[PDB]
RNA sequence: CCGGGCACUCUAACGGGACUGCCCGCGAAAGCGGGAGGAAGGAGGGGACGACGUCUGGUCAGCAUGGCCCUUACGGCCUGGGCGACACACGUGCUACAAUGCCCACUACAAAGCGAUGCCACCCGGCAACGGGGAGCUAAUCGCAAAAAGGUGGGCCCAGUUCGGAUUGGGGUCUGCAACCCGACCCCAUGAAGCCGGAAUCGCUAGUAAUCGCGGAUCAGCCAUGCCGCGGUGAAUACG
RNA sequence: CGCGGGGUGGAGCAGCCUGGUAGCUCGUCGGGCUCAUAACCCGAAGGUCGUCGGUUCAAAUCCGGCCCCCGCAACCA
RNA sequence: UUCAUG
């Protein structure tokens, strides 16, 4: 789906581009799970929000063309 | 005559006989028989061996199949079970993934109903 | 060692919406009597006092090996829940008009006693009797 | 789960629509909003005059808001000024030419929307309930009608059990389409609850 | 929560997907009609009173 | 029905034969409102009849219906203790229905695989006397007439 | 049958159009 | 499609027509059995219609409402999640388990509908969903729209199969700020369970059952196989 | 204190044959029936076969021997 | 004609 957009957020995109300034810190607390893993902007562990708390997914190159909400699983009993 | 892997059909029409090769279904078997150029309704008990290899040169060289495909499907599954994407988890415990309800259904991703349940 | 007990009148009185396997912190000796069956819940539920649940007004016999080490028998014992469950029920008391009654005191594989709490609504089965003749006719004489 | 509404059972025949106008999908919701809001103004604030129905029409920007009142002495005014202020009120919620035609009833007891309101005023005035019912049916028959039935629903007489009392004199043929049984309904909002007065008035048949 | 929501149906300065229509007389958010704008209950009690022109008990 | 006599739906006469047995056979063949396929099946069946046997397209079928037509059929009646299975003789206005329904069931269970040749090989063997439908007739006329012991309940 | 998404009747049951059920 | 034009089918008003009306048999009368004519029969077939009241039936979560309770929160706003979770059980349906069946092509045959920020004809592009132009429609006038089942003649050949289409991977298009929880479709792989079903049980007495599609509602999309309607083909039986 | 006899599904029991092939009733779980529980009907499932060591290719089966349970004796003085 | 109870 979704071939006419980069579908990244006006605050997650700004934060990862500002935190890619020559290498920076690691904390980025997002609430918007809908945004994708910013392609070629991987590396910084993002604290996604399944509702109960912020799970700190360390994003890797095997997870680049996915969304951030896959890594905040919203239920128990896997 | 075997085609790909070892998957040999006999005594059947060729344009569904190709379907027994994994990775070829009904649509690819419709397409890449007249695409090479074969009457797609010749029973493979009588298939000319020159036409068998003129078919096989399109079967193996074009798209990936049983083994090199099957293994990439399984590697996609193992890649999905990575740290915990939501589709690689629930492959990790076999539940369904693309929006299936599981309250009552999902007997083809679960089992054999383990009927250990029930109140008093 | 005791089997499942019974809150007889509460099982046959209050509508059990849902249950919890709660816990009881026994304050030192009231154990073997509850392990032998001495418990009567009549006139008791589990009441909060602004932070936590106490199983109120439960009579258990002081055990007769403690010749003078007895306990005040009908007291408020410190019940056990989880914390989000505890503040959940603390909210739900004022949200829905509940009463929190036990159902049984049953033991687990740790050899511990757990008081199976359950919610109430009342289950209003009490028949408000239809009016007899000698009041309906004087209401009608008022209506004259 | 019974007895469908004897206005809407008749409604196609023997009985007019109380609001009759027209437009398609574009302005039907938008007309109905102001047609409900005009009535929410009137029925809340003209009840002292005892309005029965609000026949609302519009041919093209001529909102005939012709109401049916028993006593227009507090819906017109002495020489007419409450009618004037009420028309400038009806201009405030719809800008159109809101011609408000008050029209009196030919007998204020053959109109079920006012008999039921009168019973509701008796209940909210704390009168005796079945005395009010058997009086209202008798006042309807002395006004002269073929048959009446005033169902007054529960919490009756300040009780706790809620029975429904009713009384009839004459015939009330509900299932007959040609009957022209007028129907009125009015809440009563006293202390012990909501007393729902209904009243059926069997006028001339056919 | 319905006096909030019968005005939340009015106000939209945010996205235009959240313009769910709410009922006019009552405040029901289900079965509200893209015609009249009443819900099915307000539609039934207005069609039976006769405050909707043209509407009628159907039998075909 | 319980009150009245419940008179039977008058059928149509058929087109090519002008007969009333054949239309009830069309109806008993007819699966899920598909009469234009069912009577198609029957006319292919009489074509296979005219191919195989030098007979009429209708005569082998009518004689098959007659030679599958039951007379004594067993009906259950609970008469206290053990529900007896009482024999009774059948009105021909029910014999026709039982006969045609047995023909369709035995023809559909008959081990040929195509539509009208199943009915062809069934009507041939039923007009002969060695078919599954006449086997079922003899089955029910051996249930009754050997279950004759409780026939004194005529009901 | 009809739950299939790649035939004629399987597409007319789902209602939509495709390679298997085209637009004229 | 018009040039001539409305004959008709139709449309939707207004009317008529069917009432034991006729005649016979039975019958105290009501009425019943039959016949004739009629298009129709003995409530012509269906709707709407549901009495006094019961179940202290259901709904304070459609609304209105007495009472009690919350009033820097049990109110209010938002972001995100959930309402979709799953060891199993149940109810209602859908497709199936095939050759009367399935697949491709081609040609027919409906009513009911619904649409100015909508329906989108007809092109171009893309296998396709759809995308870019844009005709017509303020709609018996243009559109959705294809009707499907049927029929035609080509395939399959009793095979878990060209039955089945669940599942899973991949490529995508639309809506929407947003499809990961959780949308719909498209395409290509995948091809499982399932070979007519236990004990039990349900539905149906005529255009009914069965089978087949179509429309609408709500609606951005949609969960739709549901619901509400529409027609196509169209039975068996009711001894009692 | 010494003989001999058992140990098998939640319980009560068949058993298991030189060892390889394990069940019966009730109970259980799910369904069906019923307004609902009974009863009845339908689908399965459940056991380290007293622990332990022994020869055996392999033990529940055969050989010991140890712990609980049963039946016996414990007499002459 | 079987068949126990709320
Ligand atoms: Mg899901
Ligand atoms: Mg006990
Ligand atoms: Mg009492
Ligand atoms: Mg009482
Ligand atoms: Mg007394
Ligand atoms: Mg007061
Ligand atoms: Mg919406
Ligand atoms: Mg017997
Ligand atoms: Mg017959
Ligand atoms: Mg298929
Ligand atoms: Mg065409
Ligand atoms: Mg009729
Ligand atoms: Mg109740
Ligand atoms: Mg209230
Ligand atoms: Mg509530
Ligand atoms: Mg309200
Ligand atoms: Mg709030
Ligand atoms: Mg839900
Ligand atoms: Mg089903
Ligand atoms: Mg098919
Ligand atoms: Mg529409
Ligand atoms: Mg375009
Ligand atoms: Mg139109
Ligand atoms: Mg039309
Ligand atoms: Mg797929
Ligand atoms: Mg079946
Ligand atoms: Mg049975
Ligand atoms: Mg539709
Ligand atoms: Mg739904
Ligand atoms: Mg066993
Ligand atoms: Mg034992
Ligand atoms: Mg059981
Ligand atoms: Mg001695
Ligand atoms: Mg018996
Ligand atoms: Mg008995
Ligand atoms: Mg008893
Ligand atoms: Mg009693
Ligand atoms: Zn409403």
- DSSP per residue over C22-78, as a string? -EEE--SSTTHHHHHT--B-TT--EEE-SSSEEEEEEE-PPPTTSSS----SEEEEE
Which residue range(s) make up the domain with F10? 1-155
Q: Domain holding F53: CATH number?
A: 1.10.455.10
- Pair of tokens at residue D42: 């009137």
What is the CB neighbour count within 10 angstroms for residue C47?
15
Query: How far apart are the CA of B119 and the nearest CA of chain A, in angstroms?
Result: 21
Of all nucleotides, the one whose C1′ comes closest to residue F1's CA is H238
Give me the number of domains chain F comprises.
Answer: 1
Structural domains of chain D, with CATH: 16-106 (3.30.300.20), 107-206 (3.30.1140.32)
CA distance linking residue F75 with residue C35, whole number of Å: 65
Of all nucleotides, the one whose C1′ comes closest to residue F81's CA is J1
Residue that finishes a domain, picked among B32, B48, B71? B71
Of all nucleotides, the one whose C1′ comes closest to residue B120's CA is I29
Residue C115 DSSP symbol? E
Ligand (nearest to CA of C5): 2
How distant, in Å, are the alpha carbons of C26, C74, C94 from that of C50? 21, 21, 12
Residue F73 DSSP symbol? E
CA neighbor of D113 nearest in space, from D57, D190, D54, D64: D54
On whether both B5 and B59 belong to a single domain, the answer is yes
Q: Say whether D62 sits in a helix, a strand or coil.
A: strand
Q: In what order do the strands lie in the sheet with C19-21?
A: C19-21, C113-119, C100-107
- Pair of tokens at residue F105: 């069931």
- Chain F window 50-89: residues with CB closer than 7 Å to nucleic chain J are 80-81
Which residue range(s) make up the domain with B109? 72-120
> Pairing between strand A46-49 and A28-29?
parallel
CA distance linking residue D143 with residue D170, whole number of Å: 13
Place of tokens 């004022």: C94
CA distance linking residue F73 with residue E52, whole number of Å: 65
On whether both B64 and B77 belong to a single domain, the answer is no
- Pair of tokens at residue E43: 């539609």
φ, ψ dihedrals at F72, nearest 5° = -105, 120
Instruction: Pick the residue from chain A with its C-alpha nearest to B79.
Output: A62
Q: Domain holding A20: CATH number?
A: 3.30.860.10
CB pairs under 8 A between A and B: 27
Burial of B27-39, coded b for 16+ CB within 10 Å and e otherwise, reads ebbeebbeebebe
Using the beta-carbon criterion (under 8 Å), do E38 and D32 form an inter-chain contact? yes
Measured between beta carbons, the chain B residues lying within 8 angstroms of A73 are: 84, 86, 89
Counting every residue, how long is chain G? Answer: 24
Residue E47 among known ligand-binding residues? no
Instruction: Pick the residue from chain D with its C-alpha nearest to E24.
Output: D33
Query: How far apart are the CA of B27 and the nearest CA of chain G, in angstroms?
Result: 9
Distance B119 CA to I27 C1' (A): 17
Q: Say whether B116 sits in a helix, a strand or coil.
A: coil
- Pair of tokens at residue B24: 């070829």
Measured between beta carbons, the chain D residues lying within 8 angstroms of E37 are: 29, 32-33
On whether both B34 and B22 belong to a single domain, the answer is yes
- Kindly state whether E21 is in contact with chain D, defined as any CB-CB distance less than 8 angstroms: no
Q: Domain holding B95: CATH number?
A: 4.10.910.10
From the list A58, A60, A70, the residue facing B86 with the nearest CB is: A70
Using an 8 Å Cβ cutoff, are F141 and F72 in contact? yes
- As assigned by CATH, the class of the C1-123 domain is mainly beta
Judged on CB neighbours under 10 Å (0-12, 13-18, 19+), F82 is exposed
How distant, in Å, are the alpha carbons of A10, B64, D52 from that of B71? 39, 10, 81
Secondary structure, 3-state, C6-33: CCHHHHCCCCCCCEEECEEECCCCCCHH
- Kindly state whether C129 is in contact with chain D, defined as any CB-CB distance less than 8 angstroms: no
Structural domains of chain E, with CATH: 1-60 (4.10.830.10)
Counting every residue, how long is chain B? Answer: 120
What is the CB neighbour count within 10 angstroms for residue C129?
6
CA distance linking residue E6 with residue D38, whole number of Å: 20
- Kindly state whether G6 is in contact with chain B, defined as any CB-CB distance less than 8 angstroms: yes
On whether both B1 and B59 belong to a single domain, the answer is yes
Give me the number of domains chain A comprises.
Answer: 1
Element (H, E) at F45: helix F35-52
CA distance linking residue B11 with residue B46, whole number of Å: 8
Do E and D touch, counting CB pairs below 8 Å (3 needed)? Answer: yes
CA neighbor of D110 nearest in space, from D133, D142, D151: D142
Using an 8 Å Cβ cutoff, are B72 and B17 in contact? no
Give me the number of domains chain B comprises.
Answer: 2
Measured between beta carbons, the chain C residues lying within 8 angstroms of D129 are: 143
The experimental resolution of this structure, in angstroms, equals 3.7
Q: Which nucleotides of H are covered by protein (CB under 7 A)?
A: 46-53, 56-57, 62-67, 69-70, 74-82, 84-91, 94-97, 99-105, 115-116, 122, 127-130, 138, 146-151, 155-158, 161-170, 172-193, 205-206, 209-215, 217-220, 223, 225, 229-230, 232-240
Write down the experimental method used for this entry.
Answer: cryo-EM
> Pairing between strand D67-69 and D51-54?
antiparallel
Would you list the domain boundaries of chain C?
A: 1-123
Using an 8 Å Cβ cutoff, are B81 and B47 in contact? no
Query: How far apart are the CA of E7 and the nearest CA of chain D, in angstroms?
Result: 15
Residue E21 among known ligand-binding residues? no
Using an 8 Å Cβ cutoff, are B12 and B43 in contact? yes
């Amino acid at each position: 789906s979704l071939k006419k957009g980069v579908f990244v957020d006006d605050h997650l995109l700004e934060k990862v581009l500002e935190l890619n300034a020559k290498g920076e810190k690691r904390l980025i607390k997002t609430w918007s799970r809908r945004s994708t893993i910013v392609p070629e902007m991987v590396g910084h562990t993002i604290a996604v929000y399944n509702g109960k708390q912020h799970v700190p997914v360390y994003i890797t190159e095997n997870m680049v063309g996915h969304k951030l909400g896959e890594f905040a699983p919203t239920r128990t009993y896997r | 005559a075997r085609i790909a892997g070892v998957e040999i059909p006999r005594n059947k029409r060729v344009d569904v006989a190709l379907t027994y090769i994994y990775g070829i279904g009904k649509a690819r078997a419709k397409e890449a028989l007249e695409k090479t150029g074969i009457n797609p309704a010749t029973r493979v008990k009588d298939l000319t061996e020159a036409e068998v290899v003129r078919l096989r040169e399109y079967v193996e060289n074009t798209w990936k199949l049983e083994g090199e495909l099957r293994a990439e499907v399984a590697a996609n599954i193992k890649r999905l079970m990575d740290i915990g994407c939501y589709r690689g988890l629930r492959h990790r415990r076999g539940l369904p993934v693309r929006g299936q309800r599981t309250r009552t259904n999902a007997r083809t991703r679960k089992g054999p109903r383990k009927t250990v349940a029930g109140k008093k | 060692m005791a089997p499942v007990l019974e809150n007889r009148r509460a099982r046959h009185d209050y509508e059990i919406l849902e249950t919890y396997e709660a816990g009881i912190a026994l304050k030192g000796t009231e154990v073997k009597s509850l392990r032998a069956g001495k418990v009567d819940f009549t006139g008791s539920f589990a009441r909060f006092e602004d932070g936590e649940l106490y199983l109120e007004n439960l009579y258990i016999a002081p055990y007769e090996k403690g010749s003078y080490a007895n306990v005040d028998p009908r007291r408020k014992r410190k019940l056990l829940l989880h914390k989000h469950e505890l503040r959940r029920l603390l909210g739900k008391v004022e949200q829905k008009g509940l009463t929190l009654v036990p159902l049984k005191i049953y033991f687990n594989e740790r050899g511990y006693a757990k008081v199976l709490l359950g919610l109430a609504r009342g289950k209003k089965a009490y028949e408000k009797r239809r009016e007899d003749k000698k009041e309906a006719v004087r209401r009608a004489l008022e209506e004259l | 789960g019974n007895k469908i509404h004897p206005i809407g059972f008749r409604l196609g025949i023997t009985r007019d629509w109380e609001s009759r106008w027209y437009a398609g999908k574009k302005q039907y919701r938008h007309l109905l909003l102001e047609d409900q809001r005009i009535r929410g103004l009137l029925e809340k604030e003209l009840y002292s005059a005892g309005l029965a129905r609000v026949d609302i029409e519009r041919a093209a920007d001529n909102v005939a808001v012709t109401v049916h009142v028993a006593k227009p002495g507090v819906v017109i005014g002495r020489g007419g000024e409450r009618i004037r202020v009420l028309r400038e009120e009806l201009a405030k919620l719809t800008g159109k030419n809101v011609a408000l035609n008050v029209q009196e009833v030919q007998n204020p007891n053959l109109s079920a929307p006012l008999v039921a309101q009168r019973v509701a005023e008796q209940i909210e005035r704390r009168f005796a309930v079945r005395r009010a019912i058997k009086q209202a049916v008798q006042r309807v028959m002395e006004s002269g009608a073929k048959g009446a039935k005033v169902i007054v629903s529960g919490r009756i007489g300040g009780a706790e059990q809620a029975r429904t009392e009713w009384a009839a004199q004459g015939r009330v043929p509900l299932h007959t389409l040609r009957a022209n049984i007028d129907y009125g309904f009015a809440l009563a909002r006293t202390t012990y609850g909501v007393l729902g007065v209904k009243a059926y008035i069997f006028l001339g048949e056919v | 929560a319905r006096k909030a929501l019968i005005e939340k149906a009015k106000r939209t300065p945010k996205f235009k997907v959240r313009a769910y229509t709410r009922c006019v007389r009552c405040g029901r958010a289900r079965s509200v009609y893209r015609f009249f704008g009443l819900c099915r209950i307000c539609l039934r009690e207005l069609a039976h009173k006769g405050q909707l022109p043209g509407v009628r008990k159907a039998s075909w | 029905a319980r009150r009245r006599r419940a008179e039977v739906r008058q059928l149509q006469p058929d087109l090519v034969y002008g007969d009333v047995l054949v239309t009830a056979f069309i109806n008993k063949i007819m699966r899920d409102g598909k009469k234009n396929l069912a009577a198609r099946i029957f006319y292919d069946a009489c074509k296979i009849i005219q191919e195989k046997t030098g007979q009429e397209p209708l005569k082998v079928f009518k004689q098959a219906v007659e030679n599958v037509k039951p007379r004594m059929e067993v009906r259950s009646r609970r008469v206290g203790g053990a529900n007896y299975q009482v024999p009774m003789e059948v009105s021909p206005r029910r014999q026709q229905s039982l006969a045609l329904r047995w023909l369709v069931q035995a023809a559909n269970q008959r081990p040929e695989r195509r539509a009208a040749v199943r009915i062809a090989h069934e009507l041939m063997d039923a007009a002969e006397g060695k078919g599954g439908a006449v086997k079922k007739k003899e089955d029910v006329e051996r249930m009754a007439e050997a279950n004759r012991a409780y026939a004194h309940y005529r009901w | 049958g009809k739950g299939d998404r790649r035939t004629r009747r399987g597409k007319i049951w789902r209602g939509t159009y495709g390679k298997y059920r085209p637009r004229k």
